[PDB]
């Protein structure tokens, strides 16, 4: 194959639906292991200030027992077959999945339906998980990146439910009752909002029969989603006891289904990423990475394209000592401007190659493919094939990158989060002025 025949030879995601509206999607291989999961259109952005944290609490109680499998029994079953049960929650999505052997798919599927359908939500377990969730909140406080991105979401989407954190404030953790959680599950764990994905040695017809045997009870065939205003704003938490400062800056980027995402991702690949444990250092094609390695300006920087249904965070996060924040801002915004006005074809080619490599390398293993299927059916209503992603990347050039980075970056108000010894984090007006060029 020539990577054009290899893309054309990738197995096809097969999608069906139950009468209740539960979608069933699978990518089959010849591997002897599979990943099967449920992805739900439920998150913190669906929570208000009183219920905020309920979804994380329900994820916490997910494996602690159902009416059929009390307490540890479920875990025992999973552990007794060599399978791995995992879960996660975001501001928009929730997922419960099993990594099992291909011959364990029936039981795995059964284990999932029970988990999403019949969680006990027992009050004793609710108190134990209350204690656990409080300790995990204090554990999350120690992670400067998690805090700085929660801050970025809180100031960018202030007044909206997208500013909410996934876990909610600790006061809600202490106040959430069983009635709160049962209401959350009854309003958000619905078949039309769920996707049963499976990647690996899984036949779609057999998975569909399993879903019709285990999920057909679910809601047949309503509060959901209001848009979230973006705000140019800054939140600076100064703690000079912290050794390194974290700075996250983002403009309003596109939502999930916007084609602008493909050129913008290309542009982010042009800026790239860095940390001080890199081989390439000063020789890196990314200008910011080479300046950061030559001057030791930062410990790391990453570009990001966070997407929600209708908006997102397009920007960069960097970590540096107190005396270099300013420099890190100057060279980062400059790169943004250099892309808006003078993108240049060869680095667009490099960024396109980086994006194709990221997309292909990410989908390695049954679990990434299962997540791709579930999250893709939630965000696009479809699994976009890699051949299509390649078609969209192939139609990117320096004119396209210049135009889209102009549309999203140039002369736009960013949202800014600073955490730590951030006295040298530039004043908001100085950053905002760094978002345009007078020469241009």
């Amino acid at each position: 194959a020539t990577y054009a025949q290899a893309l054309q030879s990738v197995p096809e995601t097969q999608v069906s639906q139950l009468d209740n509206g539960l979608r069933v999607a699978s990518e089959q291989s010849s591997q002897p292991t599979c990943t099967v999961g449920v992805w739900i259109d439920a998150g913190s952005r669906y929570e208000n200030e009183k219920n905020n944290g309920a979804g994380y609490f329900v994820e916490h109680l997910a494996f602690k027992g159902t009416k059929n499998r009390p307490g540890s029994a479920l875990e025992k079953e999973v552990e007794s077959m060599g399978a791995h049960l995992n879960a996660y929650s975001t501001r928009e999505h929730t997922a419960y999945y099993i990594k099992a052997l291909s011959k364990d798919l029936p039981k795995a599927v059964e284990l999932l339906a029970d988990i999403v359908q019949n969680c006990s939500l027992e009050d004793s377990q609710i108190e134990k998980e209350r204690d656990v969730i409080l300790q995990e909140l204090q554990e999350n406080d120690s992670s400067m990146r998690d805090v700085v991105f929660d801050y970025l979401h809180a100031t960018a989407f202030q007044g909206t439910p997208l500013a909410q954190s996934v876990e909610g404030p600790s006061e809600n953790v202490r106040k959430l009752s069983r009635a709160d959680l049962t209401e959350y599950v009854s309003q958000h764990y619905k078949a039309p909002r769920m996707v049963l994905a499976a990647a690996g040695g899984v036949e779609h017809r057999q998975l569909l029969d399993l879903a019709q045997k285990h999920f057909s009870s679910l809601s047949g065939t309503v509060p959901a989603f209001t848009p979230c205003r973006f705000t140019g704003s800054e939140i600076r938490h100064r703690d000079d006891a912290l050794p390194l400062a974290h700075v996250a800056i983002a403009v309003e980027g596109p939502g999930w289904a916007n084609p602008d995402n493909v050129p913008l991702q290309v542009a982010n690949a042009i800026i790239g990423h860095y940390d001080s444990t890199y081989g390439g250092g000063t020789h890196m094609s990314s200008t910011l990475a080479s300046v950061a390695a030559t001057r030791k300006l930062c410990q790391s920087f990453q570009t990001f394209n966070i997407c929600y249904a209708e908006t997102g965070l397009l920007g960069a996060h960097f970590v540096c000592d107190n005396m270099s924040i300013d420099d890190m801002m100057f060279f980062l915004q400059g790169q943004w401007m250099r892309l808006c006005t003078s993108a240049t074809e060869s680095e667009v080619v490099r960024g396109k190659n980086i994006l194709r490599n990221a997309l292909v390398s990410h989908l390695d293993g049954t679990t990434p493919v299962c997540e791709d299927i579930g999250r893709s059916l939630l965000t696009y209503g479809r699994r976009i094939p890699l051949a299509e992603w390649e078609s969209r990347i192939a139609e990117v050039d320096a004119s396209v990158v210049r135009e889209v980075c102009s549309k999203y970056f140039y002369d736009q108000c960013p949202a800014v989060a600073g955490l730590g010894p951030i006295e040298q984090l530039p004043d908001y007006n100085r950053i905002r002025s760094g978002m345009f060029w007078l020469r241009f």
Partner: protein
């Protein structure tokens, strides 16, 4: 809106912002001097040389 159109067409780029400022400075000098002069010669009507020169 009108100001959205003005920003999108004339203000977003600094070169075009500056060109708008230059053309506006030219036309503003003309119109502002014309108006201020008319005001001054109305306040002082008949008193100035221009008003009375045509007799000499």
């Amino acid at each position: 809106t009108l100001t959205a159109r003005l920003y999108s067409l004339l203000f977003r780029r600094t070169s075009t912002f500056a060109l708008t400022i230059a053309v506006g400075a030219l036309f503003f000098e003309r119109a502002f001097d014309q108006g201020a002069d008319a005001i001054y010669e109305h306040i002082n009507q008949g008193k100035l040389w221009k008003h009375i020169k045509h007799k000499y």
